[PDB]
Copies of this chain bind each other. A is one copy, B any other.
Amino acid sequence: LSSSLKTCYKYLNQTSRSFAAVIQALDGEMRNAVCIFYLVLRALDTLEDDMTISVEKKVPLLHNFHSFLYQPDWRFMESKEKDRQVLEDFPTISLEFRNLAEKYQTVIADICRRMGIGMAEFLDKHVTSEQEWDKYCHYVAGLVGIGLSRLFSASEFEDPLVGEDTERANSMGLFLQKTNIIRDYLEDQQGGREFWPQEVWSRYVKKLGDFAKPENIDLAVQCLNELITNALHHIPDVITYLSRLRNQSVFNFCAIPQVMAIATLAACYNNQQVFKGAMMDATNMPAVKAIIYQYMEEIYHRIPDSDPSSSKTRQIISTIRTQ
C-alpha cells in the first residue's frame, strides 16, 4: 500500500506494455526487484536516446547513473523524450530501489554501472563489425539478461546455476535486441538512428538509408536475411537457458518474449515490408521447443536459393532442429 510503490507500478505500466503483466506475475521478492530494475533501465535508456543532450553532458550522466540510485534528491528535468516521467520523478523510483534487499541492489547497481560505460562508449560511433554489433547488444540488452538471471538466483526461486551462466543469459538479451533492431529499420531510419552493422550493410549499399528506396528493395531483403541468419545463432543458447529454469513465473517471464521475438523474425524473414508496410501455449519447456521448431520451419520453407545467405540459414536451422 506504499504510495511510492503504487507509483512505480503505474510507471511500469506506462513504459512497458509488453512486459508489465509478466513482471507483475513474478513470485515473491522478484516482482518488486524486477519492476524497479526495469524502471531504472528505462531511465538510463531514455537518457541515452535523448538527442537534445550534448555528448559532453551525456557522458557523465551515463557514467554516473548507477551513483544516482543512492542520491535521494537526484532527478533530471531537461529531457524531451516519451518516457521522461521516470527521470523527472526519479526520486520515487530510487527510494523504492533503496527499499529492496541489498542482494538485489548490488546486482542492479552493478548492471547500471556497466551499461552506462558501454552506452557512453558507443555514443559517437556507429556499429561496424558483427563483433561490434554483439558488444553493443551486450551493453544494452545482454547485461539485462545477466542482471535478471542474477536476481532470479539471489531470490532463491531459481537455482544458483541460472545466475552463474552469464554466457547464455547474455545470448538471451542479444537475441531480443537483434530482433528489435532488425524489425525497427524504418522507425530508426526516421529517427536518424543507425543500428545495422556497417560491415554487413555496406556490402549491399553505400548508405544504410538506401534500403528505404524502391530501387534497392532486392538488396535490402538480402541484407535483412543475412542479419536474421545472424540472430538465429543465439537460439541454441536460448533453449539451453530456458531448459534450466524451474520456477513457473520465471519461466513465463523469460520464455514468452523469446517466443515472441522468434515469431517476429519468422514474419520478417524475406519480407520486403520491413522496408515499407509494418494446440499449445508457451508455458512448458517441451511446448516452447515445439513452437520454436514450427517457426524455424516457416523460415526454412521460405529460403530462396538465390539468396546469398541461403546455405547458412539452412545450416543454423538444421543445427536447431537436430541438436
B-binding residues in A (CB < 8 A): 1, 5-6, 8-10, 13, 17, 20-22, 24-27, 248-249, 252, 256, 259-260, 279-287, 289-291, 293-294, 297, 300, 318-319, 321-323
A131 to B226, CA, bound (A): 56
Set of chain B residues within 8 Å of A282, measured between Cβ atoms = 279-280
Closest 5 CB pairs of A and B: A249-B286, A25-B289, A21-B293, A281-B281, A21-B290
Query: Does the CB pair B279–A25 fall under 8 Å?
Result: no
Query: Does the CB pair A24–B279 fall under 8 Å?
Result: no
Shortest A158–chain B CB gap in Å is 14
Query: Does the CB pair A25–B290 fall under 8 Å?
Result: yes
**Can you offer 16 A-B residue contacts whose CB atoms are under 8 A?**
A9-B318, A13-B297, A20-B293, A20-B321, A21-B294, A21-B297, A24-B321, A25-B290, A25-B293, A26-B286, A249-B285, A256-B279, A256-B280, A260-B279, A280-B282, A281-B281
The 8 Å CB contact of A322, one of B5, B279, B297, B322, is B5
Set of chain B residues within 8 Å of A1, measured between Cβ atoms = 322-323
A259 to B24, CA, bound (A): 16
Closest residue on chain B to residue A263 by CB atoms? B279
Shortest A95–chain B CB gap in Å is 15
The 8 Å CB contact of A6, one of B248, B281, B318, is B318
Set of chain B residues within 8 Å of A284, measured between Cβ atoms = 248, 252, 283
A25 to B291, CA, bound (A): 9
Shortest A83–chain B CB gap in Å is 15
The count of identical subunits is 3
A20 to B290, CA, bound (A): 8
A13 to B285, CA, bound (A): 20
With known contacts A24-B293, A25-B293, A280-B281, A287–B252 Cβ distance under 8 A: yes
The 8 Å CB contact of A9, one of B5, B287, B322, is B322
A290 to B20, CA, bound (A): 8
A279 to B288, CA, bound (A): 10
A300 to B11, CA, bound (A): 12
Set of chain B residues within 8 Å of A321, measured between Cβ atoms = 6, 9-10, 13, 20, 24
A5 to B300, CA, bound (A): 18
A135 to B221, CA, bound (A): 52
Q: Most B CB atoms within 10 A — which of A1, A25, A318?
A: A25
A270 to B297, CA, bound (A): 34
Query: Does the CB pair B318–A286 fall under 8 Å?
Result: no
Query: Does the CB pair B281–A279 fall under 8 Å?
Result: yes
Set of chain B residues within 8 Å of A20, measured between Cβ atoms = 293, 297, 321
Query: Does the CB pair A25–B248 fall under 8 Å?
Result: no
